[PDB]
């Protein structure tokens, strides 16, 4: 046979990898393009200090990761291992981000 790891093993290696590192996990430009998009909804022909974009990317990722953390606990709370919309939803409801 050709060698193969078992569903959840590579995931765990990938957890160890990304909990060890600090580097931003979203692709810089795609994120930038997203930022300038969501900026057009408030004023046109805006500009952004290179540093203001990063300050957002660091602010976004940091945020999501901590949500996933609170999410992953609401999955585990329902005797699961798989995060699903209703888990995020519970996080945010309890966090008081939605109603």
């Amino acid at each position: 046979k050709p060698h193969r790891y078992r569903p959840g093993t590579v995931a765990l290696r990938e957890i160890r990898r990304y909990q060890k590192s600090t580097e931003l996990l979203i692709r810089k430009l795609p994120f930038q393009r997203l930022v300038r998009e969501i900026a057009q909804d408030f004023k046109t022909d805006l500009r952004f200090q290179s540093s203001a974009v990063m300050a957002l990317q660091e602010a976004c990722e940091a945020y999501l990761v901590g949500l996933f953390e609170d999410t992953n606990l609401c999955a585990i709370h329902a005797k699961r291992v798989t995060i699903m919309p209703k888990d995020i939803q519970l996080a945010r409801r309890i966090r008081g981000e939605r109603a």
Binding site: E37, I38, D41, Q49, S51, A59, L64, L67, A75, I83
Partner: protein, 80 residues
């Protein structure tokens, strides 16, 4: 264009990983892109207000910091 889809399935995975998630439902990627959108939306607004009040056309690292601090979400390393 539609740049929200530039937040690749792999990217949202890498983020769930650093958050300590083993297994991910398919439905998550669009919920996630969902929430990210609302985050960047609420934050950029308050930033641009700070940009606008300052009568500038360029959003400064501080604008975003003032914004994040406002929203509950203080950030170290971009000043202030």
């Amino acid at each position: 264009r539609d740049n929200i889809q530039g937040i690749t399935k792999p990217a949202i995975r890498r983020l769930a990983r650093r958050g300590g998630v083993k297994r991910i439902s398919g439905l998550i990627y669009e919920e996630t892109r969902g929430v990210l959108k609302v985050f960047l939306e609420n934050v950029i607004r308050d930033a641009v207000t700070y940009t606008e009040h300052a009568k500038r056309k360029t959003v400064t690292a501080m604008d975003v910091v003032y914004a994040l601090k406002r929203q509950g979400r203080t950030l170290y390393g971009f000043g202030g």
